[PDB]
Amino acid sequence: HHVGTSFRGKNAVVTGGAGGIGLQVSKQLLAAGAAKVAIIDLQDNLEEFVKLRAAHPTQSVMIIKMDVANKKGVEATYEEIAKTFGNIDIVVNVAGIFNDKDVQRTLLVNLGGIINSTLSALPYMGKDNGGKGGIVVNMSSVVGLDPMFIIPVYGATKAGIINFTRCLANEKYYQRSGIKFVTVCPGATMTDMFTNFTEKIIFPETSDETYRILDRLNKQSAADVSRCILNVLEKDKNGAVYVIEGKRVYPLEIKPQWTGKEQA
């Protein structure tokens, strides 16, 4: 029941917020007393959202059905959100999928959706456009940092997310816009995304060693990761990259790869 003060007065947009981690992120932000929370997702979860609005009468809970791969849709969706909200302090882009069999869809949803949502959010967040400034947390994976041979396509999009998000963490941009950019990379997690795993992988003969990804998923839940995300949000460290494993948050010091130390 109790609504808190941790995120009092904060307006927040959450892609993927109908299920899994995104749904918990939305709940926990409302529970922390976020003034307004918008949710962008493909699936309709009316029974969950009716309860959610009920439990948070003095808070805005806005739900939009939209494919984050849809560039113009996302743009449109943000326009509508902005007119009601007036400002966007927090964006957590959680929406993604796991399907190696469908390469095009993976790229456009996982990498494309992050990009679409991020670029779309910026005008309504940036100081130069009258915004207060804010933070964008982009969701990635551990396999984004360290490749996992079983899932090359899914991995690629996660490596792309990291590199993309770090770019925007430029000092010159921050001084102009006031927006910060953070990447979080969850490890073994109880996600429904990895259900029917071996039906969603390219090389079928890797089912023998598929234990690596799905053995210790119980280690952390969606709610655990969500708590880690809100923890990260409070840190407000620009350009930071976090790993979330075993219910815990680990910051990475990412050293440059090409420094010229190569010999010949």
Place this chain on the structure above:
Amino acid sequence: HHVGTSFRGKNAVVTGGAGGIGLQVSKQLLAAGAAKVAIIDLQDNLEEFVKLRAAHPTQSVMIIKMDVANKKGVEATYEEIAKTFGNIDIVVNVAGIFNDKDVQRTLLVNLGGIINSTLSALPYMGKDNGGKGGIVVNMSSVVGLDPMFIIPVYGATKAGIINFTRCLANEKYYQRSGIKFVTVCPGATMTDMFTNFTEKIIFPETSLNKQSAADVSRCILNVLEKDKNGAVYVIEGKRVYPLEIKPQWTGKEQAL
């Protein structure tokens, strides 16, 4: 005129081979005496290819017009190439673009095309499928390794290429297939791709000669001869630098 022996008896597929680095890669492989070379590109470049076939009468020079973003097209394209070639020893996936204003196209061409071409090539290369085995060199960027703030979208796809290519470099994959997988990351390069740069960037208010396509191409063939699985090379100033890619996630990280 002279045709060499460095790549004698080798069959090679090259995406992006109508222009820039790809075109030079195609020439240099033929000049090194590659038995067969196939080229996959959107542009026709007929006057260059008529000259090329002439200069290599005892070598196969096959040209197909095809969008590497087109999954089924690429698949189709490889079947015909395979029918003539019989096997594929070398794939260099060079085809790519620079357009940040168009995000979807960038992802599907740059990252998608690499994936499409790579996955399509594997049956015709893999030992277990009757193939001789081989090597796939995938083209990336330095910004793929170290993010460049001016070009975030283009960068993302290059980071994606690296991570993708490294995955396939698994030892279990190699003993089963015999195919190796290499990533090369060119630096400051005289590419026509970066012409009209500021018309192709997202943030408009924001403010290499050392190496050419032919220089990078020479570096690629150098890398090809090395035949080191899982390797990542930087190509800067006409020179090849191997990277020691250390894991990002260690247990030394302190929980905050």
